[PDB]
Design an enzyme around this catalytic site. Sequence first.
Site, mmCIF file in Angstrom:
data_model
loop_
_atom_site.group_PDB
_atom_site.id
_atom_site.type_symbol
_atom_site.label_atom_id
_atom_site.label_comp_id
_atom_site.label_asym_id
_atom_site.label_seq_id
_atom_site.Cartn_x
_atom_site.Cartn_y
_atom_site.Cartn_z
ATOM 1 N N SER A 96 0.802 -1.217 0.000
ATOM 2 C CA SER A 96 0.000 0.000 0.000
ATOM 3 C C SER A 96 0.838 1.273 0.000
ATOM 4 C CB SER A 96 -0.937 0.005 1.208
ATOM 5 O OG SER A 96 -1.922 1.009 1.067
ATOM 6 N N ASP A 218 -11.053 -6.206 -2.312
ATOM 7 C CA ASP A 218 -10.397 -5.328 -1.349
ATOM 8 C C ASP A 218 -11.336 -4.163 -1.067
ATOM 9 O OD1 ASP A 218 -8.810 -3.443 0.050
ATOM 10 O OD2 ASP A 218 -6.984 -4.078 -0.975
ATOM 11 N N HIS A 247 -7.456 -6.456 2.514
ATOM 12 C CA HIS A 247 -6.538 -5.406 2.102
ATOM 13 C C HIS A 247 -5.083 -5.748 2.395
ATOM 14 C CE1 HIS A 247 -5.092 -1.438 1.126
ATOM 15 N NE2 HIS A 247 -4.674 -1.221 2.359
#
Length: 270
Positions: A96, A218, A247
Site C-alpha cells: 500500500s 479489497d 486489504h
Amino acid sequence: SMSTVGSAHNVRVLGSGETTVVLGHGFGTDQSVWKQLVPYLTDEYRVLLYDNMGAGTTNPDCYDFERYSSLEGHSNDLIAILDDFHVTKCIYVGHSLSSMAAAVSSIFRPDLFRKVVMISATPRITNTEDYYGGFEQEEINQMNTAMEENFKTMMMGFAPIVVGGDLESDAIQEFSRTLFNMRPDIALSICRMISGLDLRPYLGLIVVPCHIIQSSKDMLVPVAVAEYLHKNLGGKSVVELIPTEGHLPHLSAPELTIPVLVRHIKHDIA
Ligand SMILES: [Mg+2]
C-alpha cells in the site's frame, strides 16, 4: 551507535546477495508483517526492512506533523534510508502506502529502484466525476469526521473489516496489535494524509517496472484501481489479482500471496 536514519526507522538487513530486496509495510503495521515472507528470500537476496515514520515501533517525537502531511515526507525518508544504507537498483516490495512512496521516489532517483512490487496500492480512494477510487467524497468526509469523533472506536471496526474474516483470526489479532500501538494523534494524521492523497498526476512519470498485486475483493481498493494503475503508469507493468478477500493479503492469505510475490520478485516483465 548506528546511523540516526537507521535507528529512527529500525532498519534491519538480513541475508546476502548481489540484489537487495527492500520490504515496506502499510498503515497500521510494521516490518514484522513480513516475517513469513523473509525466509523465502534471505538465501539468495540481501533483504532490507524498515518502518515508516509514525508506526508504533518508531519514536513519536520524530513524527513531524507538517512533514508527513503529504507522501513526500515518507518518500524522502525512504530515499534517505536507501542512501544511508547504500542501496542501489533494489527490488522494492511494499504494501500500500510504502509502495506508492517508492514509486514516486523512482521519478527523481531511478538509480535506487530496478522494479516496484505494489500490494493493494491505490493513487486515490475518493471518486471524482471521471475516476472511481471506491468511495464518494461525502463518504470519506463522514469517515474523517467519525475518526475524529471516536478514533479508537473507528479503528476497532476498521481493522477486522479491512483485513477480512473472523474477529478471532490470527491476522486480525496481529493487525490490531500493531494498529493499537500507534499514538492516536499520529495515526489520525496518517489517515488524514491517505484520505486526501491523489497520486494520479504522478503515474505517467513513473517508468520503473511495476508489478500491481492486490486481492480480487479489497474493501479499500477496487479492482478498477489496479487497472487504472496499469493503464496510467509510464513504464512496463503487470496486474495479478489474488483470489481472496482482504486489504493485507500478505498477512491474511500467505498461502496464496507468498507464492505470488516470490514469482514477481524473481521474474521480470518482458
Ligand atoms: Mg497506496
